[PDB]
Design an enzyme around this catalytic site. Structure first.
Site, PDB file in Angstrom:
ATOM      1  N   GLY F  30       0.801  -1.201   0.000  1.00 34.64           N
ATOM      2  CA  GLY F  30       0.000   0.000   0.000  1.00 34.64           C
ATOM      3  C   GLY F  30       0.845   1.267   0.000  1.00 34.64           C
ATOM      4  CB  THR F  31      -0.177   4.802  -0.317  1.00 33.58           C
ATOM      5  OG1 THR F  31      -0.702   4.571  -1.632  1.00 33.58           O
ATOM      6  CG2 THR F  31       0.508   6.159  -0.284  1.00 33.58           C
ATOM      7  CB  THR F  32       4.921   4.639   2.425  1.00 30.70           C
ATOM      8  OG1 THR F  32       5.601   4.716   3.684  1.00 30.70           O
ATOM      9  CG2 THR F  32       5.288   5.848   1.581  1.00 30.70           C
ATOM     10  CE  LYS F  62      -4.728   6.395  -0.323  1.00 36.15           C
ATOM     11  NZ  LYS F  62      -3.524   5.690  -0.842  1.00 36.15           N
ATOM     12  CB  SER F  75       0.257   2.904   5.524  1.00 30.84           C
ATOM     13  OG  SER F  75       0.897   2.375   4.376  1.00 30.84           O
TER      14      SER F  75
END
Lengths: 108, 243, 94, 72, 82, 244, 242, 233, 241
Positions: F30-32, F62, F75
């Site tokens: 996933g996105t850090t 997010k 995350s």
């Protein structure tokens, strides 16, 4: 006895279309098997082939041959060459009880 | 087939495999803690590992506070630790709700014993991967140590130990008590008891730690607290003198 | 080599088979796949030299045997008047 | 590269045929040239029109196959 | 090329071709005969035509009528036991 | 006898749940997200995967929020991180119901921790495969905690998780030695933007979008705010010059 | 072994795909929706000659202006009929109006999802969905005669001519060139009966063949063995020449 | 591996992904295609309707849950009504207790809460369907692309289903064009026709194959059918 | 709350629990039945292996739901007994609110409706017994015999037999009975019942139970000696050649 193990390529479908199952013998067929064994077997005038086939578990050719075989052992233990009608009835119940009796009674 | 190690049922050898694997999770953190008792008080010391420099030493604690008297020592992962921590703090509060006086020492070990059994007896609950250790000062028997395993069993202990090295810590504690023929250590002040447990701890381990690598719990009479970073450092300097 | 056995006539070579639609009728998908790679090159192969590509080196036919898989090759070979040579795997094993 | 062996009018645009497909490897892109090359032969055309490549892409393969039913 | 079992439309033209060689009643319909038998390999459909001219003899019919294919198709279905 | 990963309650012979280890792999995919713990406040920063130009900036964020005094960022999977915040927000009103006071950080820390540890006990429910990072300001100060899919959290002077956490943890440790006392909220935004560009090396296949939000005492007075205006423009141009 | 919630790699369910197989192994319900009415018919498929056609009814009556048929497994059909008439008869209580046929179809399709392992979008559970295909007809004052199809998956379309069951491929193949825009009641009854005789195995009679008609003024009607035999002899006379 | 790791949606995988969650995306691609666009005010949803026969009808792919808010489904038809019924209950709850129109941003938060619960507890399964939701408020038009896995993102316009990349080609280059058109519902509909036309590999859209729905400030949500869309064809 | 599902869909489209449930009916005790114009007859049998059964303490296999309504079953005994009690409780409720005696058509759809619930409800096993519901209706002399199946599908049958050797005995009921000319005599329906039971179990004097249903709420239960009278008349006239 089992066609599942045979080669399906050897079967060649369409050349042999005839598959015949096995049917149980009636009163007429069972008297034919008894006539072969009881011919040499000693039996009195009260021994009839119709009485034995009246009450039966509908045995195959192996158990019918074993029925007259056990009837001969009753005369050997009593030391007699003439088998009466009671030995055929006694040996018929023993072979009948060695195959199917209560089918493990159940089903509520 | 493999349902013996999946869900908890009677095995051909008569052992529960799912629960036994929870004991091996207690040594994942590699924490060796011993519990000793003074005259009127009890002092427990637990190891503290700080692998990351970003960790806050004030937030990380292996010894929690159940109440103003009874403490708790847990060795294992925090998620299974908080499962028993929320129940221990609640059952200690529910006691004075239906009774009104303070819960004794052996009572909390029994209340948490049947709860740990619920995890072992019921298949839909997994057993905790932590070991409970409760030390306090009882109003009748004085200092007492009750260490509740995840199996749900509790019994009195003189000086206990945990971790992979517990075998070496126990051997040190055996030779000391057999000479004095007493279960606890007889001392007036509670500050000397802290130096007593560190002496037996270094000889069993063989290495030295700093103020941030150790957590020293102190349970006095009708009072309980935890030494801060400056108080633990003072204990290491005080023990450096004399012995 | 002493490998010569004059049994090589064991196979079945049928030139210009007269069977057109036997088991082939009723199945549309199997017909159109064999028309481009068989009927066309056996009729006007010169258009494929101009097309720039070549016919496939092999044709993989998998499925239940005796269902017309063999008769499907005889149907496409009728319009092209192609000699049908069948090698039976049962008689091939010796 | 597969269009070099095929004889065409050089009207093939690499931008249109790339976005028309979904995740085709080097072996699947080669089969598209073979299928689309024989489509023009059905109408009696020696060369291969650029729209015949789209007809090979619009043909149903590798995704829905021959099964169209239930959700639509 | 992948081969699949023929459907009702696939077997509709199969029985009409085999019936062209034999002499039967032309007032029948082969789309109903193919519907009685479920999806099966085409090699098994040849055995059905061999059973069509048999049961018709038991009925004293030199040709296969509409009722002759009713008992002929139902005979080979129970023989496979699938 | 295999099958230890088919249930949450089944323990491996080594005493490690396989489902917990698989939850960490979902974080790396996933996105850090990063974070900075200051004295009077906390700073949160996270990037976004840009598929094309159709994405409208400053719309889908997010970064979550708990009341007005606590921000939150995760995350991992989108539905797992957003559902956990909803449980903390509904229970935050229950704390103000009985206790009338706003929920502090230590009371909010054990709030989300009891849910994550509960899903590991019941095999019939799926645990959260996301790493939750929350923080704020309370009466005693400002604290920053990092929640893990295994239910493990402690104090962190900095928070780094996700795919680019390898290069993010190195920069957070350097800021401690460079500023042992504290760090201002305005400078922390510029420093957090450089950390995002450092982990962008694996994300260079697509574009990037930076979303930074922080809450402090002497500035926001315990209010969750997003970086906008000239503060965001000066923070982007400062990090882009140092990264190249 | 395999749960009902397991998705196939193609985006479908295994239990739903196998539920449609029981429909093609049952009877065949043939119907055609025209502008002047809707004609429905079914085949009872009596195996033994001792079976009576009075007890078995594949076409029930939900409302005077609304009717439906069934095909495939008829066991699960009797449950949905009780729920279909529940939202129908009570609609005269709530709205005091004839319920829309399209609105009734949506209520039938929403009750086919009751299966599953008991995650809660609903309170009580269900073992498996209904393996019956319901062909729903009716008439209203807005769009006229409406004919829908209730699938176990929940998808429904409005069909002008729909043959469900085993006659899916056989009957619908002839409906392409035999159906058009302008139709009457006499042409609709003869076209359904002609196809019903072709899709039946044995000879058609007044017992196994039961037809129906949808009228605006008269409503849902059922032809007995005498009225059904009248169309049988009339069809043979018109089809005897060419 | 493969079927060995699937007892349910709960069981994980060594790759950190769930196979059962990914299977819901395949039902959208092989289903109907839906296209939408907006700038500052209105929104135009271009959806397609398929069927199983030429003699059948075309099922409505656009569900109206509000007068000022609407959506379009590409995916399972009956399973999309479950999420819309809950949306209709939230609109009535927000218009009664709060007496306020439900915002598009807050609407997507309640829709993803249903699928995440089915992918968490054992026995539940997500119902794969595509959702393109539109609407208007005091700020502007909001088009949020919803996924059965719980993913939601606000975009100018997008397309899902078969040939989704073909319709995104027109929206990518023209992205700077339709965003400057405000208060002109005619040009907003014509832009959606040219986007879906490039993605059609089958045939042209007839009067019953083209379903266009538009909502805005002065113009409420209307579903065009029959000859209403014949002017833009 | 036991939520575990049972009924599933086979690859061929059938249900595994329904297929094996019908096998218990064919492997159970065989029971025949017939109906005439004014009458309906339901026959039964008894196991001849070990018989200690006393006439007073032996439960009748044909249950009586109502005065003019009878219920018989060939199959699992205990699974049927639960439905027998529920049928009589429903008969009390149907006569309570509606003030009408329970009919055969209402009782058939009720039993088939109850059995339908256990098939579609997860956590309960479907029944393995197929009940044969017979009897009359209030102010109606026409017999109604409906065959209830564990799957829930029911129909009407003039002569129906389920049990062991069912496929063989059903061929005798087709030749010895016609749909257009049913026997109008209550004694002729008993003779047709015995002829079907002589091809299965030999002898069977006290091992056969026959229940005669008469209109106007009358039921005559034939004793052991009364049934043997019809057996002698048929066997002596069968041997004429």
């Amino acid at each position: 006895n089992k066609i599942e193990t045979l080669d399906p390529a050897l079967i060649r479908p369409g050349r042999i279309d005839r598959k015949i199952l096995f049917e149980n013998p009636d009163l007429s067929t069972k008297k034919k098997i008894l006539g072969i064994h009881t011919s040499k077997m000693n039996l009195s005038e009260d021994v009839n082939l119709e009485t034995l086939v009246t009450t039966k578990d509908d045995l195959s050719g192996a158990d019918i041959q074993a029925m007259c075989t056990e009837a001969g052992l009753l005369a050997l233990r009593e030391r007699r060459m003439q088998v009466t009608a009671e030995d055929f009835k006694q040996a018929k119940e023993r072979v009948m009880k060695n195959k199917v009796e209560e089918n493990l009674e159940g089903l509520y | 087939a493999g349902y013996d190690r999946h869900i908890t049922i009677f095995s051909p050898e008569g052992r529960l495999y799912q629960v036994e694997y929870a004991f091996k999770a207690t040594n994942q953190t590699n924490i060796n803690s011993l519990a000793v008792r003074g005259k009127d008080c009890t002092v427990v010391i637990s190891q503290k590992k700080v692998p990351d420099k970003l960790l806050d030493p004030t937030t990380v604690s292996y010894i929690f506070c159940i109440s103003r008297t009874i403490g708790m020592v847990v060795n294992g992962p925090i998620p299974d630790a908080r499962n028993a921590a929320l129940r221990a703090k609640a059952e200690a509060a529910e006691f004075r709700y239906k009774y009104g006086y303070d819960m004794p020492c052996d009572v909390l070990a029994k209340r948490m014993a049947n709860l740990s059994q619920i995890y072992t007896q019921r298949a839909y609950m997994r057993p905790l991967g932590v070991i409970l250790t409760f030390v306090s000062v009882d109003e009748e028997l004085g200092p007492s140590i009750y260490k509740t395993d995840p199996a749900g069993y509790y019994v009195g202990y003189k000086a206990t130990a945990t971790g992979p090295k517990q075998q070496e810590i126990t051997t040190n504690l055996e030779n000391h008590f057999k000479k004095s023929k007493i279960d606890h250590i007889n001392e007036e002040s509670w500050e000397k008891v802290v130096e007593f447990a560190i002496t037996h701890m270094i000889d069993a381990l063989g290495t030295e730690f700093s103020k941030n690598d150790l957590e020293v719990g102190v349970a006095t009479k009708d009072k309980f607290f935890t030494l801060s970073a400056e108080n633990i450092e003072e204990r290491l300097v005080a023990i450096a003198e004399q012995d | 080599p002493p490998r010569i056995d004059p049994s090589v006539t064991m196979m079945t070579v049928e030139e210009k088979p007269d069977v057109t639609y036997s088991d082939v009728g009723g199945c549309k998908d199997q017909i159109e796949k064999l028309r481009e790679v068989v009927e066309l090159p056996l009729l006007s192969p010169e258009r494929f030299a101009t097309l720039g590509i070549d016919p496939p080196k092999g044709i993989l036919l998998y499925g239940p045997p005796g269902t017309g898989k063999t008769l499907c090759a005889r149907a496409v070979a009728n319009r092209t008047d192609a000699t049908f040579i069948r090698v039976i795997g049962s008689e091939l094993v010796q | 590269i597969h269009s070099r062996k095929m004889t065409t009018d050089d009207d093939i645009n690499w931008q249109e045929l790339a976005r028309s497909t979904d995740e085709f490897n080097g072996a699947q892109l080669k089969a598209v040239t073979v299928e689309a090359g024989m489509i023009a032969l059905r109408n009696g055309q020696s060369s291969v029109k650029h729209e015949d490549f789209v007809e090979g892409i619009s043909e149903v393969q590798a995704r829905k196959s021959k099964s169209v039913s239930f959700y639509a | 090329v992948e081969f699949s079992l023929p459907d009702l439309e696939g077997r509709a033209n199969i029985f009409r071709i085999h019936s062209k060689s034999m002499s039967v009643e032309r007032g029948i319909r082969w789309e109903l005969i193919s519907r009685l038998c479920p999806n099966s390999t085409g090699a098994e459909l040849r055995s059905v035509c061999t059973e069509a001219g048999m049961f018709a003899i038991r009925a004293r019919r030199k040709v296969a009528t509409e009722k002759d294919f009713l008992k002929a198709v139902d005979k080979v279905i129970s023989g496979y036991k699938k | 006898g295999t099958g230890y990963d088919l249930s949450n309650s089944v323990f491996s012979p080594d005493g490690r749940n396989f489902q917990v280890e698989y939850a960490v792999k979902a974080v790396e995919n996933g996105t850090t997200s990063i974070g900075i713990k200051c004295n009077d406040g906390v700073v949160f920063a996270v990037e976004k995967l840009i598929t094309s130009k159709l994405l409208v900036p400053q719309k889908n964020v997010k970064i979550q929020v708990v009341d007005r005094h606590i921000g939150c960022v995760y995350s991992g999977l989108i539905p797992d991180g957003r559902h956990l915040v909803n449980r903390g927000r509904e229970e935050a009103a229950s704390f103000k119901k009985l206790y009338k006071t706003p929920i502090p950080i230590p009371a909010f820390a054990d709030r989300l921790g009891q849910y994550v540890q509960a899903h590991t006990l019941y095999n019939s429910v799926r645990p959260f495969g996301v790493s939750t990072i929350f923080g704020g300001v309370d009466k005693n100060g400002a604290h920053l905690y990092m929640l893990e899919p295994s239910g493990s959290y402690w104090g962190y002077k900095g928070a780094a998780t996700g795919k680019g956490r390898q290069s993010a943890k190195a920069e957070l440790e350097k800021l401690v030695d460079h500023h042992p006392e504290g760090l201002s909220a305005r400078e922390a935004v510029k420093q957090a933007a450089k950390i995002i560009y450092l982990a962008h090396e694996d994300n260079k296949e697509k574009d990037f979008e930076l979303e930074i939000s922080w809450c402090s005492l002497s500035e926001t007075n315990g209010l969750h705010k997003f970086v906008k205006g000239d503060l965001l423009q000066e923070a982007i141009d400062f990090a882009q010059k140092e990264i190249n | 072994d395999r749960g009902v919630s397991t998705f196939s790699p193609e985006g479908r369910l295994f239990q739903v795909e196998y539920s449609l197989e029981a429909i093609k192994l049952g009877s065949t319900a043939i119907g055609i929706a025209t502008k002047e009415g809707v004609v429905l018919g079914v085949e009872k498929r009596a195996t033994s000659p001792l079976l009576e056609s009075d007890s078995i009814e594949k076409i029930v009556e939900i409302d005077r202006h609304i009717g439906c048929a069934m095909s495939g497994l008829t066991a699960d059909a009797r449950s949905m009929i009780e729920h279909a008439r529940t939202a129908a008869v009570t609609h005269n209580l709530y709205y005091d109006e004839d319920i829309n046929v399209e609105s009734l179809t949506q209520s039938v399709c929403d009750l086919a999802l009751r299966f599953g392992e008991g995650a809660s979008g609903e309170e009580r559970l269900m073992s498996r969905p209904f393996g019956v295909a319901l062909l729903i007809a009716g008439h209203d004052a807005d769009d006229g005669y409406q004919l829908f199809h209730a699938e176990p998956s929940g998808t429904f379309y409005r069909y002008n001519a729909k043959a469900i069951g085993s006659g899916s491929e056989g009957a619908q193949a002839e409906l392409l060139n035999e159906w058009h825009s302008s139709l009457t009641l006499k042409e609709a009854e003869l076209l359904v009966l002609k196809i019903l005789k072709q899709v039946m195995e044995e000879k058609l009679d007044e017992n196994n063949a039961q037809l129906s008609c949808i009228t605006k003024q008269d409503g849902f009607k059922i032809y007995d063995n005498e009225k059904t035999a009248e169309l049988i002899k009339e069809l043979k006379e018109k089809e005897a020449a060419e | 591996f493969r079927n060995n790791y699937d007892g349910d949606t709960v069981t994980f995988s060594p790759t950190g992904r769930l196979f059962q969650v990914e299977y819901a995306l395949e039902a959208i691609k092989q289903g109907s295609v839906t296209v939408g666009l907006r700038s500052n005010t209105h929104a135009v949803l271009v959806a397609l309707k398929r069927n199983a026969d030429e003699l059948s009808s075309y099922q409505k792919k656009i569900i109206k849950c509000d007068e000022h808010m609407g959506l379009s489904l590409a995916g399972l038809a009956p399973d999309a009504r479950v999420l819309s019924n809950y949306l209709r209950q939230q609109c009535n709850y927000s218009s009664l207790v709060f007496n306020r129109k439900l915002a598009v941003e807050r609407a997507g938060h309640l829709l993803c809460d249903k699928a995440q619960k089915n992918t968490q507890s054992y026995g539940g399964r997500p119902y794969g369907v595509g959702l393109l939701i539109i609407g208007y408020d005091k700020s502007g038009a909001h088009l949020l692309e919803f996924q059965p896995s719980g993913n939601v993102t606000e975009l100018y316009g997008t397309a899902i289903g078969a040939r989704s990349q073909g319709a995104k080609t027109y929206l990518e280059r023209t992205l700077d064009t339709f965003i400057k058109i405000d208060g002109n519902p005619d040009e907003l509909i014509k832009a959606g026709v040219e986007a879906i036309s490039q993605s059609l590999r089958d045939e042209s859209l007839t009067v019953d194959n083209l379903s266009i729905a538009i909502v805005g400030k002065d113009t409420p949500f209307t579903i065009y059918d029959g000859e209403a869309v014949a002017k833009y064809i | 709350g036991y939520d575990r599902a049972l009924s599933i869909f086979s690859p061929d489209g059938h249900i595994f629990q329904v297929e094996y449930a019908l096998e218990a009916v064919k492997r159970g005790t065989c029971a025949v039945g017939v109906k005439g114009k004014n009458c309906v007859v339901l026959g039964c049998e008894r196991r001849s292996t070990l018989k200690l059964q006393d006439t007073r303490i032996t439960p009748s296999k044909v249950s009586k739901i109502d005065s003019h309504v009878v219920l018989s079953f060939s199959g699992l005994n205990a699974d049927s007994r639960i439905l027998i009690e529920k049928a009589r409780v429903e008969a009390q409720s149907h006569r309570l609110t509606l003030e009408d005696p329970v009919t055969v058509e209402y009782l058939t759809r009720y039993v088939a409706g109850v059995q339908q619930r256990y098939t579609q409800s997860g956590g309960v096993r479907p029944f393995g017994v197929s009940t044969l519901i017979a009897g009359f209706d209030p102010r109606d002399d026409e017999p109604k015999l409906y065959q209830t199946e564990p799957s829930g599908i029911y129909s009407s049958w003039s002569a129906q037999t389920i049990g062991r050797n069912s496929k063989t005995v059903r061929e005798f009921l087709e030749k010895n009975y016609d749909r257009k000319e049913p026997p109008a005599t209550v004694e002729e329906c008993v003779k047709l019942t015995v002829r079907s039971l002589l091809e299965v179990v030999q002898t069977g004097a006290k091992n056969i139970e026959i229940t005669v249903v008469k209109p106007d709420s009358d039921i005559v239960a034939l004793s052991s000696e009364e049934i043997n009278q019809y057996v002698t008349q048929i066997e002596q006239e069968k041997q004429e050649q």
